[PDB]
Amino acid sequence: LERQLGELREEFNALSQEIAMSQLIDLALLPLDMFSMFSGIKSTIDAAKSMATSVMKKFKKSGLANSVSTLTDCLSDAASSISRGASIRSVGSSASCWTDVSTSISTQTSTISRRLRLKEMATQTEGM
Amino acid sequence: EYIENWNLQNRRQRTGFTFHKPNIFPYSASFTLNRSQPAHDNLMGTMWLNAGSEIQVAGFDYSCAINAPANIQQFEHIVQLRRVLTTATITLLPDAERFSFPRVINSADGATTWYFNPVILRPNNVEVEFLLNGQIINTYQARFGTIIARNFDTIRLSFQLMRPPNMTPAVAALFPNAQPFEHHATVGLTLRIESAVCESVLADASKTMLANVTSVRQEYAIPVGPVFPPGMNWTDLITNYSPSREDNLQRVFTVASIRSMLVK
Amino acid sequence: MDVLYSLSKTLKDARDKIVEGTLYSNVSDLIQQFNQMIITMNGNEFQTGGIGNLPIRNWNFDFGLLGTTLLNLDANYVETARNTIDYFVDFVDNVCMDEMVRESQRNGIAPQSDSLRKLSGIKFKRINFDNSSEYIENWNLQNRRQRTGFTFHKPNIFPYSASFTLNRSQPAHDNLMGTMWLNAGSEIQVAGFDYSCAINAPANIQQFEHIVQLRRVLTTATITLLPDAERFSFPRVINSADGATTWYFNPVILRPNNVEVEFLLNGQIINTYQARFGTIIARNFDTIRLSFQLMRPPNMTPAVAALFPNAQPFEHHATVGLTLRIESAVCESVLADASKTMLANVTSVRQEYAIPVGPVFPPGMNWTDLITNYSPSREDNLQRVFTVASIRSMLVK
Amino acid sequence: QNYGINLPITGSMDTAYANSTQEETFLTSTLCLYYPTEAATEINDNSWKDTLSQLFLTKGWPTGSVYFKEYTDIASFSVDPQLYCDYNVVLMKYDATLQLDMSELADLILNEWLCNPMDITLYYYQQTDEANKWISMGSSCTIKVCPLNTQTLGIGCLTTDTATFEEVATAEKLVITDVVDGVNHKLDVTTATCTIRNCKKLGPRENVAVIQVGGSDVLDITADPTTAPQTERMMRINWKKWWQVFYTVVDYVNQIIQAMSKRSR
Amino acid sequence: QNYGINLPITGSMDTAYANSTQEETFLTSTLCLYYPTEAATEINDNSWKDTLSQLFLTKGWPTGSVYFKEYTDIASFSVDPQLYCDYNVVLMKYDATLQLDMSELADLILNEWLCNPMDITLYYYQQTDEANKWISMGSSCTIKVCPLNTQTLGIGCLTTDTATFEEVATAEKLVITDVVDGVNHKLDVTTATCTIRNCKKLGPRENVAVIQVGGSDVLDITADPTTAPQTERMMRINWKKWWQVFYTVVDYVNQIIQAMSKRSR
Amino acid sequence: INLPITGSMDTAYANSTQEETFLTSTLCLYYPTEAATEINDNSWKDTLSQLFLTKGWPTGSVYFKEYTDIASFSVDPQLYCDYNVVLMKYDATLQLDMSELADLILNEWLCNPMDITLYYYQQTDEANKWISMGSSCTIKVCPLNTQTLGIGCLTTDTATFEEVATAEKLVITDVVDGVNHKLDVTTATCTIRNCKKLGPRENVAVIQVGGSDVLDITADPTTAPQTERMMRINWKKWWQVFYTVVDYVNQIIQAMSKRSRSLNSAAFYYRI
Ligand SMILES: *[C@@H]1O[C@H](CO)[C@@H](O)[C@H](O)[C@H]1NC(C)=O
Ligand SMILES: *[C@@H]1O[C@H](CO)[C@@H](O)[C@H](O)[C@H]1NC(C)=O
Ligand SMILES: *[C@@H]1O[C@H](CO)[C@@H](O)[C@H](O)[C@H]1NC(C)=O
Ligand SMILES: [Ca+2]
Ligand SMILES: [Ca+2]
Ligand SMILES: [Ca+2]
Ligand SMILES: [Ca+2]
Ligand SMILES: [Ca+2]
Ligand SMILES: [Ca+2]
Ligand SMILES: [Ca+2]
Ligand SMILES: [Ca+2]
Ligand SMILES: [Ca+2]
């Protein structure tokens, strides 16, 4: 599927600028549930399968989900015994799991923001 | 400064003596083994030399944290000063020197000896806590160089030895999974109190009052007194910095400075 | 600021000289000065504090002058003097504490802690008694621009940097050539290491050079230069550049040959030293160039020839080290030392009263991040806070 | 006298080195030699034991502190070696065909193993670390293994047809087996004439001293093929007679006992 | 992304250690064992490769990453080796009568050689350093060499009479020849069956690892007799079967891959 | 190396590396049997070496390697020299073979093996091709659909497959990049390998001795480039050709450059 996926990449990199800003900001305040996302398909082409299951059986094998599970287990073990908190080598004054530096200020901040990528899909946000 | 603090103490007020490189630590070179055997072949412990104005501590593991949890071993040293200090300017560095070469040390009971062939790594999870009355006051994590402490009677240096998870052959051949362990992983820390201020009186690397006192006593052959030890060994005279000793020491230092203002 | 220094100095000289039984002929001038200061203060109301945990105190000065009828002193005079001096001392201490904590990029020399802006007025000019200290003298000289100088003992001018540089690298890290250096406070410990003992190099010689660039010029520096750097002279496990993996380092110390130490200034050379070890001098320099060499011993005994073979294993790595300590120095600008407590006083005040971080000083006032970027605004604010900290230390150490 | 616990010990660096416990440790300790039958065979003397005892008496070791314990062969010695003394020496002949067995013997006696039993008819066992091995003693051990998968089925073997199992030993008196750590193994063993025990190698035993008599040093105690170490109490000699060897041992018995150290456990 | 340039690198010491690249390097690399036919013969099985692969799968190495490549004999392997993987392990049987052969094989594979060709019939060659050796591969090499003098006359040999030469190799499959460095040699070689190449020894190859399954470690990588070193990727085992050896290799594969590192070139 | 390089435009052009690269490098010519046959001499190689010795190239640096035919040479070419020159005779019937040879040697390939029987492979980019070498290669291919079935061919009936090569020693195959092919190849007589095309190989130099320059290295029919190290002579003899090469070897080595990637004896790299 390499050539088809490249064609679709090109379609994205040519429709991206044809997308609008006002209506996009209007759409980004919508709780678009599974039905809202999978009912408005272009033609509901032919009696398709359960699209939620179809996408999820690929979704839960990836970097995103595995990183979620890793954050989970590294708060869990850390709260269970003091080896992981004491090992992650935070900057100081707490290490629950978050302030971990796997890889100066720039480095630490990038490493921490790659964990803050989960604050968006963890309900720890307030804004857009 | 001395007569001024004298007049202050007489008219009770917050005094201060500004010291550069103060000899406040008694000479103490000593080790502590938390996993020992008769043959001394797999050890974990910490060794410290506290001398004058400087401290050199080092935590050693012969197994490089192979059996410990998370491939990490913890070391802690709690120095409990005899008098409080303020505005201490301190220089902290890694990889302490005098615990970094081959050594042959006798055990606690001086019965047998054991060898020590170190390999210096960096200390991770390093935490320096300056405490006063057990209440922590100043905290530093991973900050080396010139640092400050504003009020403290105790210092806590807590570092770790972490086994490198990724290792090249030349260093993997040094940390095998067997007991012989002819290379012992170490992590060191040096700490020098370059300058500070104290409400009491001490000795330094700048003033000669103590030397004038001890020279007078050695010259005129004074018997041992009830208060000061024989010869005025600063080690055994700072070990017990009782109020009587402190008063007599302030007094003799003051009159020694007074004499030094005339005859040098 | 001059009036603050004069306040602290006359109060120190008062708490020192004014004592029972003394002779009025020795403190007549200081008493006339104290009365003049009382006159210049009476009728003013100052305020101090309001940033952080500093309390907001309001100072009112309504005192009485000291009589000049006496010919000897007594307790009913000393005690009046003391009950009048304690208030001025607390005022000066609170002013210095309200001034050490404030910053500004726009004319940071111009005083903060507005009470001090007021004391800098023209009617308060009648309090200047003597600007005798080094810091106040250099302050006055700078205001009347002239060649200043601060003398330092073991100055902390080098930010903490402990790092390597490999001019021949490999993934397996088995045949390396490079230099390691630790620059901290007043000390530079550098060490050039070759794993092959300069076997494949021309003439059996390998060059090593370390260039250091100071952020401020120094003059009349006394330096102690010795060979065989110590902290890079034992076994070690060091990381790679990207920090992923580690390599080993088992050193064997040799002597530098063809050593050359060059103290330069604006790229031009000023002082040069060939194979001179011990106590040396450097009269003007913003740059140091330590260039040494590792020369393979042409004649070798069996025990040492069994360490440097012609093949790649190289289980002993030849090193050439140099320690360099700046014992004394002189600087146009202000720095930190191992003798004075100004920086300690400042940082302690800030940590105690929980001062937020400002637009000039870094968090916690760490000398590394504060010397690495020694820009004119930071230098001015640093001079200001160090001067007023010295003023405060003259009274309350 | 807090046994069963481990506490931080402390000391100093100003204390001086105390007197020599030698000439007292010899008297309040015991020395047991393990020589081969070939030695006494070549010798053909009945008083050689009293001779070596009177010789030890010059070095300091008293008369009834020395013990000699014969063994017909290295394998007969490997069959349940029971070393119960305060200083053990073991003179070991070299044979390129016996290399593996006399290295297993070394790995068994030089170290101190914590041994739990094993029952093959009921359970299937797996290893947890790299030092949790299976040592089999007896007169003729024939050991076969079938590893299992996640779902309790063999890998290149069947859990009924013992012939398909994988053979690691064949009529050996002593065996020390290490397998892949993380996988359950089904075992076939001659339980009637061999006992197998699951043992963990703890820190070493500083109470024995192996002295190879012939060939170059080959003993690879550490099962992992990276160390190949030579311990301090692993001695070598080159021989043409035995009296010279015993005289060497007696003359250098102090270095031997300095290389050894009374046990901890 | 510069290539072919050697630039100074720089780093620091306050940087923390990153995570364990194992369990990902396994998946993103490849492993190739080189076992002798005697191993498969003793084993007498045809599913042992898949068994070892399913075992490796428990260590992290996936199915299509591990490979087993058989070689009938040390010398047959030595005849034009081509080790092209991302991690190579070699199980070498010990043989006194093949000591120099399996030392030359080790010196050939363990190290990385920069090879140019050789035209004996036209030119007269010389060595410049102790690393420019002459390696000859083929079915049966019979080499003879005559050093020449300042005026290209022979020294104890006749440039015409091939029989006066000094035969240094007699019917060998692999020869590595180091001769006196600084003189011009003239060679006689059975070029119909053997090809010789002037090869300069560069730094080591960290991609291959030899494991002497049997006797003591004898391999002298360095041609010069003074050093006689031993590196990390030169291992040793003692053996009586082969299943145990393969189980050991598997269980301590991570130690092997720690002792090895991917190639610089 | 991921680091940067720095330079300055004020520096001076340093002395010539020529007359030292000649001394610390090696050169290797590849001539046809036809040339030695026309020459009918035995010491012509030592002659050419003594002639190079005037141009600076020392005695033990120049080599000659005979190759019976272009195809026999293309069959597993092992180029191991610091500088390689090739003399290549033109033949219309061998145009594609001596263009595949060019694409093989002038470029630097990174090859992996291909198991036809158990697996099926596809090409991703225009630089990932399938090269087969041996004595007689015959390749047939069937492209498949999304549901793993043929397209105008049957997965079983090998005759239904589409024949891309017949009786060829070297074959370079480029197919539609993004579909899965099933192959039929005489594995007993020809081994095939999935090779990606990296940057060029600056160590070889092709010299077409006869016809016009026709070699189209780049498989896409839109570049048809003429690289620097792709030369042409017109010939009526071989001695004049060799004299020309010897008298203009400096230009050839100025047009060539030592490799950058790594050391290797064959015409490509292997990564399994
Ligand atoms: C230790 O040895 C010295 C010198 O041989 C001796 O004087 C001393 O008495 C000995 N110690 C004891 C406790 O006998
Ligand atoms: C680092 O390694 C440890 C031990 O293998 C593992 O538990 C941890 O998940 C690793 N870190 C990440 C980010 O995967
Ligand atoms: C480079 O060429 C110039 C001009 O001929 C010459 O003067 C110079 O010496 C040459 N460089 C060297 C290193 O010989
Ligand atoms: Ca056995
Ligand atoms: Ca195991
Ligand atoms: Ca089977
Ligand atoms: Ca050979
Ligand atoms: Ca040679
Ligand atoms: Ca001859
Ligand atoms: Ca073709
Ligand atoms: Ca068809
Ligand atoms: Ca294609």
Could you write out the three-class secondary structure of chain C? CHHHHHHHHHHHHHHHHCCCCCEHHHCHHHHHHHHHHHHHHCCCEEEECCCCCCCCEEEECCCCCCCCCCCECCHHHHHHHHHHHHHHHHHHHHHHHHHCCCCCCCCCCCCCCCHHHHHCCCHHHHHCCCCCCHHHHHHHHHHCCCCCCEEEECCCCEEEEEEEEEEECCCCCCCCEEEEEEEEECEEEEEEEECCCCCCCHHHEEEEEEEEEEEEEEEEEEEEEEECCCCCCCCEEEECCCCCCEEEECEEEECCEEEEEEEEECCEEEEEECCCCEEEEEEEEEEEEEEEEEECCCCCCHHHHCCCCCCCCCCCEEEEEEEEEEEEEEECCCCCCCCCCHHHHHHHHHHHHCCCCCCCCCHHHCHHHHHCCCCHHHHHHHHHHHHHHHHHHCCCC
What's the CA gap between E79 and B22, in Å, rounded? 74
Between the CA of E224 and the centroid of ligand 8 the distance, in Å, is: 9
F170 CA distance to ligand 10 middle (Å): 5
Distance CA F117, CA A84 (A): 48
Q: What three-state secondary structure class fits B3?
A: helix
Report yes or no: D26 and D65 within 8 Å, Cβ to Cβ: yes
CB contact under 8 A, E259 and B173: yes
Torsion of CA A19, A23, A29, A32, to 10 degrees: -60
Which chain E residue shows the shortest CA-CA distance from D222? E237
- Using CA coordinates, name the residue in chain E closest to A107: E15
Phi and psi dihedrals of B40, rounded to 5?
A: 50, 60
Q: Does E239 touch chain D (CB under 8 A)?
A: yes
Residues of A in contact with E15 (CB under 8 A): 103-104, 107
Note the ligand closest to the C-alpha atom of A67.
2
Q: What sign has the CA pseudo-torsion C151, C155, C159, C165?
A: positive
What is the number of the ligand closest to the CA of B163? 2
Distance separating alpha carbons of residues C289 and B64, to the nearest angstrom:
39
Instruction: Give the integer Cα–Cα distance in Å for B95 and B60.
Output: 12
Stated length of chain F: 272
Please report the beta strands in chain A, taking only residues with DSSP state E, as ranges in sequence order: none
The verdict on E11 touching C (C-beta cutoff 8 Å) is yes
What's the start-to-end Cα distance of chain E, in Å?
15
Q: Which residue of chain C is at minimal alpha-carbon distance from B146?
A: C367
C338, C156 contact by CB (below 8 A): yes
Inform me whether the C-beta atom of residue B158 falls under 8 Å from chain A C-beta atoms.
no
Count E/F contacts: CB-CB distance under 8 Å: 61
Q: How far is CA B33 from CA B161, B163, F136, in A?
A: 15, 20, 75
Q: Is C79 within 8 Å of C15 (Cβ atoms)?
A: no
The residue behind tokens 């009830």 is B226
Question: How far from the centroid of its chain's Cα atoms is residue C317's Cα?
Answer: 36
Q: Does the CA dihedral B58-B64-B67-B68 come out positive or negative?
A: positive
E15 and A CB contact within 8 Å? yes
The type of residue at C285 is F
Q: How far is it, in rounded angstroms, from Cα D221 to Cα D111?
A: 9
CA-A70 nearest atom, ligand 2: 9
Nearest residue of A to residue E18, measured between CA atoms = A102
By DSSP bridging, strand F230-232 and strand C45-48 are unpaired
Q: Is D250 on the interface with E (CB under 8 A)?
A: no
Widest CA span in chain C: 96
With touching defined as 3+ CB pairs under 8 A, do chains D and A touch?
no
Ligand with the closest atom to the CA of E146: 9
- What is the CA(F178)–ligand 12 centre distance, in A? 9
Establish whether chain B is in contact with chain A, requiring a minimum of 3 CB pairs below 8 angstroms. Answer: yes
Nearest to E89 by CA among E212, E189, E238: E212
E160, exposed or middle or buried, with CB in 10 Å at 0-12, 13-18, 19+?
exposed
Contact E23, E61 (CB under 8 A): no
Distance CA C58, CA C55 (A): 10
Pocket test for ligand 2, best of A68, A70, A87, A98 (most atoms within 8 A of CB): A70
Neighbours of C130 (CB within 10 A): 13
Residue in B125, B126, B138 to test binding to A, most A beta-carbons within 10 Å:
B125
D31-66 burial by CB neighbour count: b if 16+ within 10 A, else e? bbbbbbeebbeeeeeeebeeebbebbeeeebeeebb
- Say how many C-beta atoms besides its own lie within 10 A of residue F256's C-beta: 19
| Dihedral (CA of D22, D24, D25, D27) sign | positive
Residues in chain C: 397
Residue B185, SS3? strand
Chain E residues closer than 8 Å to C300 by CB: none
Instruction: Output DSSP code: residue B225.
Output: P
- Dihedral Cα B199, B205, B210, B216, nearest 10 deg: -160
Distance of alpha carbon D150 from its chain centroid, rounded? 36
Residue type (1 letter), C212? V
Between β-strands D9-10 and C278-295, what pairing exists: parallel, antiparallel or unpaired? unpaired
Q: Is F51 helix (H, G, I), strand (E, B) or coil?
A: helix
- Quick one: D152 exposed, middle or buried, by C-beta within 10 A (0-12, 13-18, 19+)? exposed
Q: How far, in Å, CA of F271 to CA of A22, rounded?
A: 51
Nearest to D105 by CA among D117, D86, D88, D120: D88
Contacts of residues E2-6 at CB distance under 8 Å and 24 or more positions apart, as own/partner, are E2/F1, E2/F2, E2/F3, E2/F4, E2/F5, E3/F1, E3/F260, E3/F261, E4/F259, E4/F260, E4/F261, E5/F1, E5/F5, E6/C167, E6/C168, E6/C169, E6/F1
Q: Closest Cα to residue B61, out of B96, B34, B28?
A: B34
Atom of ligand 2 nearest to the CA of E23: 5
Chain E nearest C-alpha distance from A86 (Å): 14
Neighbours of E180 (CB within 10 A): 10
Residue of chain C with shortest Cα separation from E6: C168
Q: Which chains touch D (3 or more CB pairs under 8 A)?
A: B, E
Label the pairing between strands E194-204 and E185-188: unpaired
Q: Tokens 């009529």 sit at which residue?
A: D171
Distance CA(B263)–CA(B216), nearest Å, equals 13
Cα C380 vs. chain centroid, distance in angstroms? 14
- Alpha carbons B20 and B87: distance in angstroms, whole number: 12
**What's the rounded Cα separation, in Å, for the pair E217 and E230?**
9
Note whether E231 contacts C: Cβ–Cβ < 8 A: yes
Of F63, F260, F271, the CB nearest to E117: F63
How many CA within 13 A on the CB side of residue C129?
Answer: 22
Taking residue A57's Cβ as centre, other Cβ atoms within 10 Å add up to 9
* Residue A74 alpha carbon, nearest atom of ligand 2: 9
DSSP string, E23-70: TTTTTTS-EEEE-BHHHHHHH--SSHHHHHHHHHHHHT--GGGEEE--
Distance from CA of D43 to the nearest CA of E (A): 31
| Residues near ligand 12 ion, CB 5 Å cutoff | F 123, 174, 177
Ligand at shortest distance from the CA of F134 = 10
User: Phi/psi at C348 (nearest 5 deg)?
Assistant: -65, -45
Of D155, D168, D228, the CB nearest to E54: D155
- CA distance readout (Å), B225 to B230, B237, B248, B257: 8, 12, 11, 21
Contact residues on chain A for B140, CB-CB shorter than 8 A: 92
Is there a contact between E168 and E211 (Cβ–Cβ < 8 Å)? no
> Is C153 annotated for ligand binding?
yes
Chain B residues close to E208, C-beta within 8 Å: none
The residue whose two tokens read 């997308």 is A19
Amino acid occupying residue C91: F
Cβ separation B141–A81 shorter than 8 A: no
Collect all residues with Cβ–Cβ distance below 8 Å to C147 and sequence separation of at least 6: C141, C332
Nearest ligand, CA of residue F95?
10
CA E204 to chain F, closest CA, distance in angstroms equals: 13
Shortest Cα–Cα distance, A104 to chain E (Å): 8
Residue E259 has its nearest CB partner, among B144, B164, B172, at B172
Asked if residue E21 has its Cβ within 6 Å of ligand 2, the reply is no
- The DSSP 8-state label assigned to residue F224 in this structure reads -
For E16, which DSSP code?
A: P
Task: Please give the Cα distance from E237 to D227 (Å, whole number).
Answer: 10
For D67, other C-beta atoms within 10 Å of its C-beta total: 14
Pairwise CA distance, residues A25 & B50, whole Å: 65
* Experimental determination approach used: cryo-EM
- Resolution of the determined structure in angstroms stands at 4.3
The Cα–Cα gap between D225 and E247 comes to 12
Whether chain B lies against chain F with 3 or more Cβ pairs closer than 8 A is no
Positive/negative CA dihedral, A23, A26, A29, A30 = negative
Strands F107-113 and F128-143: unpaired
Strand extents, DSSP E, B4-68: 17-20, 25-35, 44-52, 54-61
Torsion of CA B59, B61, B64, B69, to 10 degrees: -90
- Which residues are near ligand 6, the ion (C-beta closer than 5 Å)? D 156-157, 164; E 45
What are the residues whose beta carbons fall under 8 Å from the beta carbon of C37, sequence distance 6 or more?
C7, C10, C127
Q: Is the CB of E19 under 6 A from ligand 2?
A: yes
The span from the CA of F74 to the CA of D114, in Å, is 65
Q: What is the DSSP code (8-state) at residue B157? A: E
* Ligand 2 proximity of E20 Cβ (cutoff 6 Å): yes
CA angle, residues C373, C262, C279, in degrees to nearest 5: 95
Burial of C273 (0-12, 13-18, 19+ CB in 10 A): middle
Torsion of CA A15, A16, A17, A19, to 10 degrees: 80
Contacts of F18 (CB under 8 A, 6+ apart): F56, F250, F253, F254
- Residue in C with minimal Cα distance to E21: C244
- Give the residue from C96, C107, E16 showing the smallest Cα distance to B164: E16
Distances (CA, A) of A122 to A68, A80, C72: 9, 21, 81
**Residue D124: how many CB atoms within 10 A of its CB?**
15
Tokens encoding A98? 């978050």
Strand partners, C45: C60
Strands D166-167 and D234-236: unpaired
Which residue type does C393 have? Answer: S
Chain B touched by E1 (CB under 8 Å):
no
Q: Classify E160 as helix, strand or coil.
A: coil
